Amino acid sequence: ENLWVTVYYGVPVWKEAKTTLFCASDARAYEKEVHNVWATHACVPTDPSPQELVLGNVTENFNMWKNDMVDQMHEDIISLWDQSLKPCVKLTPLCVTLICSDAGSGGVEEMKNCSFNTTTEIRDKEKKEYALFYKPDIVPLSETNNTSEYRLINCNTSACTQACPKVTFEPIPIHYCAPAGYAILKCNDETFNGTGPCSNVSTVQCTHGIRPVVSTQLLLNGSLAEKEIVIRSENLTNNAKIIIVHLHTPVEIVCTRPNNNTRKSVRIGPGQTFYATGDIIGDIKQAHCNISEEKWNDTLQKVGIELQKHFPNKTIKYNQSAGGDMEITTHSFNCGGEFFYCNTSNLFNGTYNGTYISTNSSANSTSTITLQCRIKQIINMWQGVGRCMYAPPIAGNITCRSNITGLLLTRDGGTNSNETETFRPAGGDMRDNWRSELYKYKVVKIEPLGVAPTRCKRRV
Amino acid sequence: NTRKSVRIGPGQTFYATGDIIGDIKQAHCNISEEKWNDTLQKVGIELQKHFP
Amino acid sequence: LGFLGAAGSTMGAASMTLTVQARNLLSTVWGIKQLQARVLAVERYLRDQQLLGIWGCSGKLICCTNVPWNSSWSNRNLSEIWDNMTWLQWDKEISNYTQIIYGLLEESQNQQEKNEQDLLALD
Amino acid sequence: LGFLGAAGSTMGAASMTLTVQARNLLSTVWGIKQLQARVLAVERYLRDQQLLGIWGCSGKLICCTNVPWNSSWSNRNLSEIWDNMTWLQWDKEISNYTQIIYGLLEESQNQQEKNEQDLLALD
Amino acid sequence: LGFLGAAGSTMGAASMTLTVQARNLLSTVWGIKQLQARVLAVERYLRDQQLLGIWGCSGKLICCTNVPWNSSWSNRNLSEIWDNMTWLQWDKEISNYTQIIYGLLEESQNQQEKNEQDLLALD
Ligand SMILES: *[C@@H]1O[C@H](CO)[C@@H](O[C@@H]2O[C@H](CO)[C@@H](O[C@@H]3O[C@H](CO[C@H]4O[C@H](CO)[C@@H](O)[C@H](O)[C@@H]4O)[C@@H](O)[C@H](O[C@H]4O[C@H](CO)[C@@H](O)[C@H](O)[C@@H]4O)[C@@H]3O)[C@H](O)[C@H]2NC(C)=O)[C@H](O)[C@H]1NC(C)=O
Ligand SMILES: *[C@@H]1O[C@H](CO)[C@@H](O[C@@H]2O[C@H](CO)[C@@H](O)[C@H](O)[C@H]2NC(C)=O)[C@H](O)[C@H]1NC(C)=O
Ligand SMILES: *[C@@H]1O[C@H](CO)[C@@H](O[C@@H]2O[C@H](CO)[C@@H](O)[C@H](O)[C@H]2NC(C)=O)[C@H](O)[C@H]1NC(C)=O
Ligand SMILES: *[C@@H]1O[C@H](CO)[C@@H](O)[C@H](O)[C@H]1NC(C)=O
Ligand SMILES: *[C@@H]1O[C@H](CO)[C@@H](O)[C@H](O)[C@H]1NC(C)=O
Ligand SMILES: *[C@@H]1O[C@H](CO)[C@@H](O)[C@H](O)[C@H]1NC(C)=O
Ligand SMILES: *[C@@H]1O[C@H](CO)[C@@H](O)[C@H](O)[C@H]1NC(C)=O
Ligand SMILES: *[C@@H]1O[C@H](CO)[C@@H](O)[C@H](O)[C@H]1NC(C)=O
Ligand SMILES: *[C@@H]1O[C@H](CO)[C@@H](O)[C@H](O)[C@H]1NC(C)=O
Ligand SMILES: *[C@@H]1O[C@H](CO)[C@@H](O)[C@H](O)[C@H]1NC(C)=O
Ligand SMILES: *[C@@H]1O[C@H](CO)[C@@H](O)[C@H](O)[C@H]1NC(C)=O
Ligand SMILES: *[C@@H]1O[C@H](CO)[C@@H](O)[C@H](O)[C@H]1NC(C)=O
């Protein structure tokens, strides 16, 4: 008639906690005999059988703006980017004054000759060499009106470290897996705002293939949405929170380049050599990118018709960024080991007033949007603690036939009685891409012990 | 005055002593007299247990 | 059926699925994290095993203990407890009185062991 | 109580405090030392638990064996040992003969298991 | 006898020496390699202990399981196995059949535990 304490093993209860995570990669990336993909060879091989168990009738709170997986992702990418340049060449003796001039043959705009002198195997003798450095990597140091003295940009701040000429910067997928005694709750709701309750939560060992691309403004290769466009924001009231738009129908984007000569090898010490741009064989053409016109138009129209839900009696507008330097105001990414920084002025030129304009013309697919841009070599990413990379050039022509999946916008300062507020592309920190990728998941700790009062009593 | 910042390389900048504004005074230390006197006196009267 | 088969089900319905929910407790830069997760899994499994092994319930699910249940912990009848409430909110309201319960089972187990010692030494 | 509550008390009173003392066996420059200490704590606990598990006293705080007790090890009476001697000088006295006792418990466990196997396979 | 005292001895005489080969399973430049090897040894022992405990044979060296042995596996007479053969040839000609034996032991333990909880609940 009384009650006695009974211990239960295997009780399904959760606790919110933070822990370190594994690494999982496919077995097809281990066949390459050259060490590459920024050291993604030490991960345990994932099983070829993904297990996903759906929970019955439970709800769960979710918050992606205060998450531990995003911070661990950012710290892992920072530390592994800093680790891959340790045995590489240091660009210490390239701080010499560069006697630069325009080439005699042709115009060759956006490049300068910049011939210097460097030490041989003897510390006494020095020999003259030449290269072809890009225009944004060259700073005119000047005490008078001298139009020939130039120096390297990264010899003024820090670092001066070359990338090794054997690794690749391709985005190989990785999976973050919780250890034993931990699980990952994943929300499968199609209308997930980003913060709040979820009614279709499922327990998961670990995630899908996460592509760690490097991008600003627009978002490169990644997972799509499920049903419609989905808009995420922290507060959606202030003008300092970067709003994320997650698309449903991708838009094809390609990028090209002209032809370089080769990687001219210049020796600057015992064993340590660097590869610069030699001559240029062919013509001089701009390095551009192409995006389909009608796909971008009705994609931005769908973004307009669903961004008008939160602003029902207002019209939206688009323009460029509000000024700044090169690295923040331009959509920047990587392809084939070459970095691209391109303005998006022709992509954010429009407005939506609440009226849908259909485009029923199958014979007008010829029109495309072009984006003209330049290429940097000395790289200052992460906005600090970056250990500035000198990317070596690539000999042949390169192509970046890719996929677009998301947009990073930011509101402006809205004046009083305004109904035509504008949205601008945003740069910011690198946490936003992985936060847009790790929205579904939350790490959790299971506790398999419990107590309960029962009618059972042990034998005396 | 301040840390005079002298740059000797690509990012390796050190800070040396710059100027001095004012007069020149000697960096000193101060200890109360009677507290130190009776503290050393207590040290002596308790150290006298091991030396008769 | 692996992790969390009936995590939001009835209290009495979770008793028949305990044999399949607690089966997977053990089954450079990215080498240190693997080592730390490995050691942490070892710590969790060994702590769980010894804590289940102090009060004489090693390797046995649904273990019965002769310590009386005080009415100051729940003060509500067992019928609606075992057919109305899930595990999570029950764990939320029991979490303030876990150390006293663990001490009571430890004392009861040790007294039981001393009683068995005296009983076997009486012969 | 806490960390070694009956650390100096009566031998008989130190037999009812085994649970509250054995529970705490698992609970950059300064990152290697913490992990190494945690691993060696696991090493010591697993060695102790395995040594308890060899002679058939696994999961029991107090266990009895059938090996005879030689009088040459102690040559002392039971009553004043259990009511007058603290554990510390007792372990100091028996420390010259622990390996013989461990080997005798090991041999007695193996012989008892072989007799149990013969009796069980006889049927 | 220490390491492998009966690695080629009589099969019937090798059953008196399992304790000494089970007592010793745990006993900068090289601050990580020995740490990884030591943690690997700990998880090897823990995997062995969990695999022993998963079919109800924990804390007991020679445990018995009620699942039968099929005639398509060994088809050989017991007397000259236990009086003539050694362990190494047995591991040579049985190790290709071990996984289904482990599955049969797991299913037999599941059946035994389910009959045990049914008998406890019906009483
Ligand atoms: C988003 O998603 C897109 C789609 O996958 C990615 O684009 C791919 O980028 C990779 C580079 O990381 C491209 O791979 C490169 O292809 C070049 C051309 O390949 C053709 O020619 C070769 C023979 O030369 C054929 O074998 C092949 O089948 C093609 O017909 C190669 O020349 C490149 O070789 C380089 O890498 C190897 C391996 O390290 C080196 O040994 C070489 O010397 C050289 O350096 C390379 O293989 C791939 O082609 C692209 N896909 C498509 C469809 O074009 C984006 O990178 C991805 N991310 C972003 C941010 O956009
Ligand atoms: C950059 O200037 C160097 C000279 O400082 C050029 O190198 C010369 O190229 C001509 C080609 O007609 C050779 O005849 C000379 O012998 C070269 N001089 C050297 C190597 O010291 C170099 O061509 C210029 N760069 C470009 C792109 O024209
Ligand atoms: C060395 O780097 C510093 C940055 O720490 C440069 O300072 C600014 O650089 C930008 C980029 O050209 C200029 O627009 C600013 O006018 C510079 N000054 C300030 C106060 O912001 C500095 O110019 C670099 N050195 C040289 C010689 O260019
Ligand atoms: C809702 O929860 C109850 C818990 O009593 C469960 O029995 C029922 O199956 C759940 N509903 C669904 C559709 O799973
Ligand atoms: C570079 O070094 C060489 C050493 O051979 C020297 O003759 C020359 O004057 C230096 N300067 C330039 C601008 O070439
Ligand atoms: C929950 O997500 C799963 C994912 O496989 C899906 O099959 C299921 O239909 C979802 N539940 C509801 C109620 O839509
Ligand atoms: C941010 O959100 C909180 C609560 O959701 C709200 O009180 C606050 O006013 C918001 N911030 C701004 C700038 O509106
Ligand atoms: C974008 O911002 C500029 C900044 O003054 C403003 O003049 C312009 O009207 C805005 N819209 C467009 C479509 O350029
Ligand atoms: C991008 O294009 C716009 C429009 O032609 C132009 O004003 C701007 O200078 C270009 N470059 C950058 C870095 O924005
Ligand atoms: C935007 O589009 C209009 C009309 O298509 C065009 O006149 C204008 O030059 C474009 N660019 C900017 C920066 O307004
Ligand atoms: C650029 O490279 C691609 C490789 O996919 C090749 O098909 C194309 O012909 C190249 N461009 C030119 C102008 O040759
Ligand atoms: C991008 O879109 C194209 C066309 O739908 C598709 O073939 C490609 O697989 C997509 N990219 C990724 C990474 O899925």
The alpha carbons of chain C give a radius of gyration, in whole angstroms, of 19
Q: Does the distance separating the beta carbons of A158 and B11 come in below 8 Å?
A: yes
CA atoms within a 13 Å half-sphere pointing along the CA-CB vector of D46: 26
| CA distances (Å), origin E55, targets E52, E64, E106, E112 | 6, 10, 5, 10
Q: Write the CB contacts of A406 (distance below 8 Å, at least 6 apart in sequence).
A: A218, A219, A222, A244, A245, A246, A247, A436
A24-25 vs A44-45, strand pairing mode: parallel
Considering only CB atoms, which chain E residues are within 8 Å of C19?
A: 110, 113-114
Residues C95, C96, C97, C99: what is their CA dihedral angle, to the nearest 10 degrees? 80
Q: Is C59 exposed, middle or buried, given 0-12, 13-18 or 19+ CB atoms closer than 10 A?
A: middle
CB nearest to E53's CB, from C35, C39, C59: C59
CA-CA distance, B24 to B5, in Å (whole number)?
23
Q: Which helix (H) or strand (E) is A425 found in, with range? A: strand A422-425
Considering only CB atoms, which chain C residues are within 8 Å of D58?
A: 58
A368-373 vs A287-292, strand pairing mode: antiparallel
The distance from CA D22 to its chain's CA centroid, rounded to whole angstroms, is 11
Q: Which helix (H) or strand (E) is E82 found in, with range? A: helix E78-84
CA-CA distance, B42 to B40, in Å (whole number)?
5
Q: Find residue B17's DSSP bridge partners.
A: B3
Nearest CA to ligand 8 atom 5: A322
Structural tokens at position E16? 């008196």
- Preceding-residue numbers of gaps in chain C (C–N over 2.5 Å): 27
Amino acid in position D86? T
Q: Does the distance separating the beta carbons of D50 and E25 come in below 8 Å?
A: yes
Neighbours of A390 (CB within 10 A): 24
Technique of determination: cryo-EM
Ligand in closest contact with the CA of A344: 9
In chain E, domain spans? 4-120
Q: Which of A163, A184, A165 lies closest to A175 in space, CA to CA? A: A184
Question: Ligand 11 within 6 A of A259 CB?
Answer: no
DSSP one-letter string for A106-143: S--TTEE--BEEEE-SSSS-EEEE---EEGGGEE---S
| CA distances (Å), origin A373, targets A55, A389, A409 | 50, 20, 21
Distance in Å, CA A27 to ligand 3 centroid: 47
Are C66 and A460 within 8 A, CB to CB? yes
Q: Which of A127, A140, A211, A222 lies closest to A176 in space, CA to CA? A: A211
Beta strands in A16-125 (DSSP E): 24-25, 44-45, 52-54, 60-63, 98-99, 111-112, 116-119
C62 touches chain E (CB under 8 A): yes
C63-68 vs A4-15, strand pairing mode: antiparallel
A243-246 vs A441-454, strand pairing mode: unpaired
| CA distances (Å), origin A26, targets A69, A186, E96 | 21, 22, 29
Are A340 and A289 within 8 A, CB to CB? yes
Q: Does the distance separating the beta carbons of C120 and D62 come in below 8 Å?
A: no
| CA distances (Å), origin A57, targets A198, A450, C10, E46, E87 | 11, 21, 10, 36, 53
Q: How many CB pairs under 8 A join D and E?
A: 45
CA-CA distance, A237 to A440, in Å (whole number)?
23
Are A382 and A156 within 8 A, CB to CB? no
A92 touches chain B (CB under 8 A): yes
Interface of A with C in 170-189 (CB under 8 A): 179-181, 183
The DSSP symbol for B4 reads E
Phi and psi at residue A450, to the nearest 5°: -160, 170
CA-CA distance, A316 to A355, in Å (whole number)?
12
Q: Which of E98, E74, E88 lies closest to E6 in space, CA to CA? A: E88
Coil, strand or helix: which one is D101?
A: helix
CB nearest to E26's CB, from D32, D50, D109: D50
DSSP one-letter string for A203-244: EESB---B-----SSEE-S----SSS-EEE-SSSSSSSSPEE
Q: Find residue A317's DSSP bridge partners.
A: A351, A422
Q: Which helix (H) or strand (E) is E103 found in, with range? A: helix E98-122
Q: How far is D53 from chain C (nearest CA, A)?
A: 13
CA-CA distance, A94 to C90, in Å (whole number)?
68
CA-CA distance, D61 to C107, in Å (whole number)?
12
Q: Which of A409, A402, A454, A399 lies closest to A436 in space, CA to CA? A: A409
CB nearest to C42's CB, from D18, D42, D59: D42
Q: Write the CB contacts of A415 (distance below 8 Å, at least 6 apart in sequence).
A: none
CB nearest to E26's CB, from D36, D43, D120: D43
C58 touches chain A (CB under 8 A): no
Which residue is it, tokens 């000609």? E93
Q: Which residues, judged by CB distance below 6 Å to any ligand atom, belong to the binding site of ligand 3?
A: A 139, 141, 156-157
Interface of C with E in 9-28 (CB under 8 A): 19, 26
Q: How many CB pairs under 8 A join A and B?
A: 12
Interface of B with A in 2-31 (CB under 8 A): 10-11
Coil, strand or helix: which one is A286?
A: coil
Residue to substitute in A135, A319, A320, A341 for testing ligand 9 pocket (most ligand atoms within 8 angstroms of CB):
A320
Q: How far is D105 from chain C (nearest CA, A)?
A: 18
The DSSP symbol for A374 reads B
CA-CA distance, A100 to A132, in Å (whole number)?
9
Q: Does the distance separating the beta carbons of E42 and D43 come in below 8 Å?
A: yes
Angle between helix axes C32-54 and D29-54 (nearest 10 degrees) is: 40
D110 touches chain E (CB under 8 A): yes
HEC string for D55-97: CCCCCCCCCCCCCCCCCCCCCCCHHHHHHHCCHHHHHHHHCCC
DSSP one-letter string for A149-206: EEEEGGGTTS--EEPPTT-------BB-B--TTEEEEEE--TT--SEEEESSEEEESB
In angstroms, what is the resolution?
A: 3.8
Q: Which of D19, A396, E34, D84 lies closest to C107 in space, CA to CA? A: D19
CA-CA distance, A54 to C3, in Å (whole number)?
10
